């Protein structure tokens, strides 16, 4: 919350009622897939879950399940922090090889921000290109805009209504903190976000089928929506969706805040130039190192609060190379200046690569991803 | 019953006077409908705008709806539809009829399927009133919301401009109601704007809307009129109807959940006769002597009120009003008259409802272009 080393996610798990992703669960995931678990799991980035056990049972018993995650398109400007969940979702889809549903809440943002319907919709379609740039299989993923899809689904709105009937205003005032002063749109929005947790909201993909297990990978701050969804699921004859939580991507200023596009000073946008990335890291990445280089060589740095090192934790694939850096920074063998330099050498190509991928997705490609249709996945209807 | 003059002032609407009725006559070339001549449709909002438009040859459309609470519809439910069908013929305009299955699902102990099915059934009776299938689109919220490129978009726009406080004070909602109810008002509001029916008005957003309804639906539209400007749409005009009397009296409340509360559209010749005689509150005197001397009271006699809604011939209605008030006519003879009017009415409606085939209902509920052409150009 205010700790320089970030939030206490063990306390968070507790006051959230979720369960920790332990060694046991990570080994099971490895066993079930025969693949080495993604570094987000190995390193505690995706630290919490809800019913991942069930998802695994289903997967091992050849039962089907699908992925569902989303994005609030509040702007054309996305940052590196926004990529975490998507990066992991793309891994989950390749590893388990299941269909994916990605909700673009353009209506949410229209409701909450000073935006035009076309703006909101435009940001959804633009952000979709960035999501497509993460590598999702065009034949296994449906990226939809709430504004468009609501009007071209024989089952989506039906579920929204079912959910709306089972969630009182008091409940959402408690869960999300709404007040008598908010517009009725905001008050009923949670149902829109919950609805995609149920397979029959996507007839063109699951056609009336209502049992497919849903797995929702998302940043921990989205949990309240699905904590609510899980309570209503049984009440309306549907299965509870499973969750896989991720920690907040640290703001440049320090781990006590998540990177927020609101404050561009804390973000590294996917549209920043190599130069801008370098100067943002060098000038703004909070350092766990010592004040003078002499003191650094003598006492060493503190990785637990160093933002530059935390970023490496998310983007440096190689486990061994990261460890050297950790040890060398801690022993003072590596100066924060060199740590910084190392991070910049990881992000510049990360972001430049992403821009290259994004430039590749043409109007025709986006349109297809956003067209409801069968996802070359056969279900025992 | 209720003093509708004090209602007009409270609600801040306008009384339908003779000028307005004469104007409607001139604009339509028809004799104004008896509901109009007899004050059944007594209040309005902007009806003059609608007339200015029609006179200047601009277009306008009709919007009304039905809450499918049950498969059981009674004579009082037809009032706004009988009138609306008249307005459609007389002005010759496209009509949109909203079946709020979602509202009933939210408010009642029903399943989505039931609410929906009730909407389809009720739609049969609505079609039985004789609406032109080339000029009217009847839709289920549950279905249309899911296949319209403009309906949901308008709901969201409306939802952004109405706070919980607002609907709390208007509909009396509480922190305890479900979130579906808190936002439903926006759904009843949406069809007030033409671009909610892109298929029928070719994406026009400036088409004048006329909403004929029972005075108790006004709140939904006072709200709608309030937001219309805030989202660049013209506000809808209204024509209010009085409450239909409950058999037990113009004081008590009626319901589809009370077979003797009114005369249901499925009743037999015998049941109609039985109901009127046994349950129609009488404005007659306690004894025949008092009746002959001081006469009956038509202002509290439910049977007479009924005749006011269904007896077409003005002169005969007056002869009965006169004879009952003079005591010349006993309440038993009055009852007799009402029954001769109601039996053929329900009988005929039941006959036309049987002519409503599943494909007819489907065509009516199928979003499509109606037999009207609207142009919209922009480069
Ligand atoms: N509401 C989230 C986006 C979202 C919608 N559905 C989701 C499911 C999983 C994760 C995120 C989402 C936001 O504002 O960012
Ligand atoms: N809500 C009204 C039905 C309705 C919906 N839209 C309307 C428009 C005009 C008049 C009535 C309606 C009811 O419960 O009966």
Swiss-Prot record, chain A:
Main location: cytoplasm
Effect of residue 357 to W: In NEDMSBA; uncertain significance; when tested in a zebrafish wars1-knockout disease model it fails to rescue head abnormalities while it partially rescues the ocular defects and is able to fully rescue hearing deficits
Keywords: Aminoacyl-tRNA synthetase, Angiogenesis, ATP-binding, Cytoplasm, Intellectual disability, Ligase, Neurodegeneration, Neuropathy, Nucleotide-binding, Phosphoprotein, Protein biosynthesis
Outcome following mutation: residue 364 to D: In a breast cancer sample; somatic mutation
Enzyme class: ligase
Molecular-function GO terms, alphabetical: ATP binding; kinase inhibitor activity; protein domain specific binding; protein homodimerization activity; protein kinase binding; tryptophan-tRNA ligase activity
Catalyzed reactions per annotation: tRNA(Trp) + L-tryptophan + ATP = L-tryptophyl-tRNA(Trp) + AMP + diphosphate + H(+)
Phosphoserine: modified positions: 260
Induction context: By IFNG/IFN-gamma.
Coiled coil location: none
GO cellular component terms listed in the entry, alphabetical order: cytoplasm; cytosol; extracellular exosome; nucleus; protein-containing complex
Localization per record: Cytoplasm
Enzyme Commission code: 6.1.1.2
Residues recorded with modification N6-succinyllysine: 63
Superkingdom in the source lineage: Eukaryota
Motif range ('KMSKS' region): 258-262
Name listed for the protein in its UniProt record: Tryptophan--tRNA ligase, cytoplasmic
Gene field: WARS1
